[PDB]
Design a protein around this ligand. Structure first.
Ligand code: CQ9
Ligand code: FE
Length: 287
């Protein structure tokens, strides 16, 4: 059984139900080729100057990613396509509101570009969030997923160049005895396609075998606003923040948040008022 593939336009209402059942789905043409081009252009130089994940110069080194991975997060200050087109994706927001309605508001836990050098080895099969949010492991096994991960191809995903592996149905597994590469299928994707998984879906980046292709992706981890993001936008210039939509501002932690509790008292509030009301935060102001 292969990963179900869905149209971002026509099959919109089926995307989250598909992931909820099978643990993965491919959203064909999630981002247009044009958004992909612009995003690639914008992040290019920052990918190039990015050192190894556990570089000695970092005070939060990432010891888990391979030395042949480059990860660049906090994309808003770096990319117009990201902070405008991506953060406002209608497809993304329908899926996220489908997925997280039982909990309340959601935001970006991390939006990162990942680039894999030629001959990058495959990752060990894993679930996300275990190196940042121990709390997730203590949730009841049937609790609705508290984060999901959009893995957006920014270049072709082939079997040959290390397209992602997923184990369909593994988001519901409790006993991990059958975890093996034998159980996986591949996410073959064109640029702009997206693989959508939950935080319980067992998956791994694939082994790059050509020795010449450089595979790149945009990973967008969306999570309930009750969970702390992996990345901070606190240092993003106010002019940039005030160029965004109110929705994009909330996704980046520049607005208060709400839970779904009937008499919700809110998150990140200030003596009963919102961040944005308190700071008189403007929105949609061109730079
Ligand atoms: C270390 N890590 C990440 O840096 C990461 C990167 C992008 C998006 C999410 C993310 N979160 C993770 O939990 C984790 O896929 C995890 C993983 C496990 C094993 C091997 C490689 C990665
Ligand atoms: Fe992962």
């Amino acid at each position: 059984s292969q990963i179900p593939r869905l149209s971002a336009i026509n099959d919109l209402h089926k995307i989250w139900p598909t992931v909820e059942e099978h643990g993965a789905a491919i959203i064909e043409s999630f981002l247009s080729l044009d958004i992909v081009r612009r995003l690639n252009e914008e992040v290019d130089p920052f990918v190039k100057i990015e050192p190894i994940p556990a570089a000695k110069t970092k005070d939060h080194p990432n010891h888990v990613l391979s030395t042949t991975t480059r990860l660049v997060n906090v994309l808003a200050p770096i990319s117009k396509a990201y902070r405008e087109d991506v953060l406002n994706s209608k497809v993304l927001h329908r899926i996220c509101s489908d997925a997280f309605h039982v909990y309340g508001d959601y935001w970006v836990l991390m939006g990162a570009v990942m680039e894999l050098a030629p001959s990058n080895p495959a990752q060990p099969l894993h679930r996300d969030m275990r190196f940042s949010h121990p709390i997730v492991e203590y949730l009841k096994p049937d609790a609705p997923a508290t984060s999901i991960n959009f893995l957006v191809a920014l270049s072709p995903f082939t079997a040959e160049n290390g397209a992602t592996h997923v184990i369909l149905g593994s988001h519901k597994w409790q006993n991990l005895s059958n975890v093996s590469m034998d159980a996986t299928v591949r996410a073959l994707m064109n640029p702009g396609d997206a693989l959508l998984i939950t935080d319980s879906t067992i998956h791994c980046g694939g082994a790059e075998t050509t020795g010449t292709e450089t595979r790149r992706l945009l990973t967008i981890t969306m999570g309930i606003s009750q969970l702390t993001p992996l990345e901070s936008n606190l240092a993003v210039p106010r002019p940039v923040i005030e160029s965004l939509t109110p929705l994009a501002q909330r996704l980046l932690g520049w607005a208060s948040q709400r839970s779904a509790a009937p008499r919700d008292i809110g998150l990140l509030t200030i003596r009963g008022n919102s961040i944005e009301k308190t700071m008189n935060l403007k929105a949609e102001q061109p730079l």
